[PDB]
Design a binder for this molecule. Structure first.
Ligand SMILES: NC(=O)c1ccc[n+]([C@@H]2O[C@H](COP(=O)([O-])OP(=O)(O)OC[C@H]3O[C@@H](n4cnc5c(N)ncnc54)[C@H](OP(=O)(O)O)[C@@H]3O)[C@@H](O)[C@H]2O)c1
Ligand SMILES: NC(=O)c1ccc[n+]([C@@H]2O[C@H](COP(=O)([O-])OP(=O)(O)OC[C@H]3O[C@@H](n4cnc5c(N)ncnc54)[C@H](OP(=O)(O)O)[C@@H]3O)[C@@H](O)[C@H]2O)c1
Ligand SMILES: NC(=O)c1ccc[n+]([C@@H]2O[C@H](COP(=O)([O-])OP(=O)(O)OC[C@H]3O[C@@H](n4cnc5c(N)ncnc54)[C@H](OP(=O)(O)O)[C@@H]3O)[C@@H](O)[C@H]2O)c1
Ligand SMILES: NC(=O)c1ccc[n+]([C@@H]2O[C@H](COP(=O)([O-])OP(=O)(O)OC[C@H]3O[C@@H](n4cnc5c(N)ncnc54)[C@H](OP(=O)(O)O)[C@@H]3O)[C@@H](O)[C@H]2O)c1
Ligand SMILES: Cc1c[nH]c2nc(N)[nH]c(=O)c12
Ligand SMILES: Cc1c[nH]c2nc(N)[nH]c(=O)c12
Ligand SMILES: Cc1c[nH]c2nc(N)[nH]c(=O)c12
Ligand SMILES: Cc1c[nH]c2nc(N)[nH]c(=O)c12
Lengths: 250, 250, 249, 250
């Protein structure tokens, strides 16, 4: 019978495309979401119409807190409830906004959201995934620009760097269990909805390969590769999917 | 008048050596400590005997929490209270222990300690340092083995990777203010008290340059360079002080 | 209308497995070789027996010299001669042996180790670009480039130079629609000269399975990078090392 | 008696500042040069007028060829002939110009000059230095922008990458002899004489720390640090001296 995947933040944009591609590949999927219930439920509806009871939704805040470990355990539990197994975890959900060092949300809340979503929740989901255990693997959505970071995005950038460390540490630790742990690192893919079109076009013009952003599907293609049998010896690797952007000097 | 430095976790081991060498160079120093009050007071005594009114202690827990931003603000305030200025911040304090992914602190506590000390506290101290602002700089104590991490040290490794990101992000953002941000990355220096002698000797035998761990003073020498007028164009750099250890394959 | 690929050092081992997988995917192939003529011709025969007129051999020494640019140009020319096009270049051929700092002269060691691992890939890349669909180059790198084998300075310098080429060429050739990427094995097929005991020592260091990668596993990554599933990927080096590079001393 | 250093390409610019600063620190120096004979001799005259018998000159082409190994042996031998010892080797000499992949010097000459000066000569000098052998070390002049390379500078970038490899491989291999091997990686320092003023200003404006290039002396300061007793545990490290330039995204 069919393998099962959890994709965090799967209601929209890149997470949605990953969930859809995994589903087209034969996976049953847990569509995790936070606020986007309509989009999550609509996606599960689309996938279940394609193949009955091959998709479920699971809501959780992945901000760091006292209850985050239980929340992450329940996400993995929801995959076993629905499908009796959990083969693939994709850590995609991510808060992304500036946190300037020099002078809305308190800074402790910004820490909670940015470090929780990008690092701590992936760590806790990774714990719960492994504890509950074939071709088992984890794919972490990293960032090709982590060493050339956006100005005033220190907490975001810290969370993504921590995610590289988790990818490597978990690859090493989980290898004895046959669980591979890899990353996919977009440069610019779907640009933020709140970005103006002038600013979007400025980023596009920087990308060497085609002067355009990656589609969500091009990002998902790398995830599909990493979870496949064609990546059976790949662990601890982070594949940039950035059209050369990270190679361009200032 | 004499510049001033804050050193976190300065009561013992590497931080103590750092504080000592800063003081020998002419700095006034805030000796931050958490639990090691006797060692901290004793160090301030020794330094004030050498030059009166040039050392104070400052107690703070650097575990993550909603009041960590206030604690970090108060550490920087304590330097201004004692000395009227704060020229150098050294982020040295660090929790270090295993957190296995599979199999009596709660995981919430482990996250708070390891990510708070190694990453979030450095970030909040950097914010407070900058907000309060000559040769101004910050030095982060990193880890040369961050990409070849110890088995079952995921959270620690996550915090140290996050600290690399902070070093880079803050270097970029604080450059306009004339604040340099750099790192020093030991391999093995003073080995942990709790580590057994056999295990210490196994690590020693791995170091190409001398088959021995670094002294705390050797680590301090790199901090002294980075804060000095000889490093005036250096920002965002992490200097390994590892005797070649990170170059050795499995 | 089938695309064509040049694979350097393709007569045996990993280059053979790459050539075979590319052929199985639908490519016509130039099997470049240096000394392994019998193995090269035998491979071309297997492939042509599957699909007529889809494989040719091409001999060349890739040691650095003043005629190396001509040799590299001729390898690319040989793909256009046989197939009328050249879509994919795989830089796989490589000399590998120690060159301690303290029979071959040092001049020869530089020529072979830097030639095969870095300069020939550069010249092949120049000739490939000059003669120009889903065009790409794949360089065979080394996951252990930053934790090098003792006394392999020149080999390691060549593999580091190859990373630089991968990045430099990705940048410069992107406007031509040519993608340039790498595949970095840790331990795969161990050297023929290596003793079984020494092999086992290396196998035991690999976190994922305590074994070396198959040639096919390496080839799989090459196939991904040349495919339409990697159309936005350029300047990326994919480790295929079972976690080996993550293991401390 | 006084230790002795070889500095390649020491007649002008950064190499000259390095030789001067080593000499000021107390070293006797071999000034290697290729075409800049008048400047080389003028420097030797200046240094010797300062302290007698502390500077000599050695001419050689460092282009790759069948005779380069002998030329490199002779450079090292010049230090022994004059001073009876050779404590420090600085690999500074470097060809730097574009070599476009798609369409003066033939390409084989470009390869010889760019890979020879930046990689092969450093390797052969290192062999010669080690074979002839206290605080012994080698410092290689690297490039902070090696991973965000100048368009159409493939062979130069290849040579600098190879030099990183040499730095690491030689640090590992020479550690048992007590020879440290490290690098210094400028971003922009003294800009090329042939670069137009407008283009120079364009580079300066990209540097976060001060919006200007590094003086040669600032580069030399990091060299002095690495050769000093304050760097006794440091080997295989490359210190960026780039004002944050390499952290700046496109
Ligand atoms: N877009 C790019 O160009 C780009 C570039 C580099 C890296 N990446 C990485 O690729 C991944 C996908 O990027 P994206 O642009 O598709 O992401 P996104 O739209 O910014 O965020 C994806 C989802 O994250 C979830 N999320 C945010 N905060 C959360 C919280 N506190 N708790 C739980 N879930 C939360 C949201 O779920 P709801 O909508 O349900 O609230 C959101 O839809 C991210 O990890 C990102 O860092 C993207
Ligand atoms: N030792 C090595 O070989 C090595 C290797 C790589 C990197 N480093 C890095 O170099 C730095 C110094 O190393 P080290 O061995 O000297 O460190 P350490 O002895 O392990 O820790 C230094 C100090 O950190 C403080 N600390 C721990 N938890 C804290 C908390 N919750 N709040 C506030 N302070 C806390 C402690 O202060 P109190 O004693 O006052 O409680 C402790 O004395 C660290 O950042 C470390 O990770 C060291
Ligand atoms: N094997 C591994 O574990 C491993 C690990 C890390 C990286 N890699 C990389 O993966 C690639 C394949 O590895 P491999 O073990 O299959 O390679 P290999 O068997 O050591 O060498 C491959 C071929 O290179 C060709 N070659 C050597 N010197 C040459 C010269 N002067 N001119 C032209 N061709 C020459 C030879 O062709 P003839 O036989 O026709 O003379 C040889 O068959 C290499 O780039 C290697 O560095 C391999
Ligand atoms: N300038 C920068 O911003 C910058 C940036 C990044 C890295 N770096 C690195 O820092 C070092 C010094 O930079 P720089 O700008 O001072 O160097 P440079 O002026 O470009 O060159 C230094 C010297 O290299 C020697 N040289 C060139 N080709 C040679 C050959 N074939 N044989 C022997 N020697 C040769 C020349 O000696 P003669 O004059 O005697 O002929 C020249 O004076 C170089 O390694 C460079 O790559 C510099
Ligand atoms: C454009 C971008 C870079 N990194 C990102 N991370 C998240 N979560 N969302 C985004 O839109 C982006
Ligand atoms: C041995 C070691 C590596 N990293 C460390 N970090 C801290 N805080 N304390 C330590 O003792 C170590
Ligand atoms: C084991 C190995 C690592 N790197 C290699 N490069 C070549 N060419 N051949 C080999 O056998 C290896
Ligand atoms: C500006 C620059 C970057 N890298 C360089 N290398 C050499 N040799 N000379 C230069 O002028 C530069």
């Amino acid at each position: 019978e069919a393998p099962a995947a959890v994709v965090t933040g799967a209601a929209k944009r890149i997470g949605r495309a990953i969930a859809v591609k995994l589903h087209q590949t034969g996976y049953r999927v847990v569509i995790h979401y936070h606020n986007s219930a309509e989009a999550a439920v609509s996606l599960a509806d689309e996938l279940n119409k394609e193949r009955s009871n091959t998709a479920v939704v699971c809501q959780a805040d992945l901000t760091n807190s006292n209850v985050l470990p239980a929340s992450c355990e329940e996400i993995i539990n929801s995959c076993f409830r629905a499908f009796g197994r959990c083969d693939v975890l994709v850590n995609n959900a991510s808060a992304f906004y500036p946190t300037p060092l020099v002078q809305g949300k308190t800074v402790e809340t910004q820490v909670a959201e940015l470090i929780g979503t990008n690092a701590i929740a992936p760590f806790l989901l990774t714990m719960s995934f492994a504890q509950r255990q074939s071709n088992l693997s984890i794919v972490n959505l990293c960032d090709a620009m982590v060493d050339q970071p956006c100005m005033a995005f220190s907490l975001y950038n810290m969370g993504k760097h921590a995610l590289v460390g988790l990818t490597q540490s978990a690859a090493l630790e989980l290898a004895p269990y046959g669980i591979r742990v890899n990353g996919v690192a977009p440069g610019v893919s779907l640009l933020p909805v709140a970005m103006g079109e002038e600013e979007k076009d400025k980023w596009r013009r920087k990308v060497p390969l085609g002067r355009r952003e990656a589609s969500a599907e091009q990002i998902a293609d790398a995830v599909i590769f990493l979870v496949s049998g064609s990546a059976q010896y790949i662990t601890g690797s982070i594949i940039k999917v950035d059209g050369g952007l990270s190679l361009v000097h200032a």
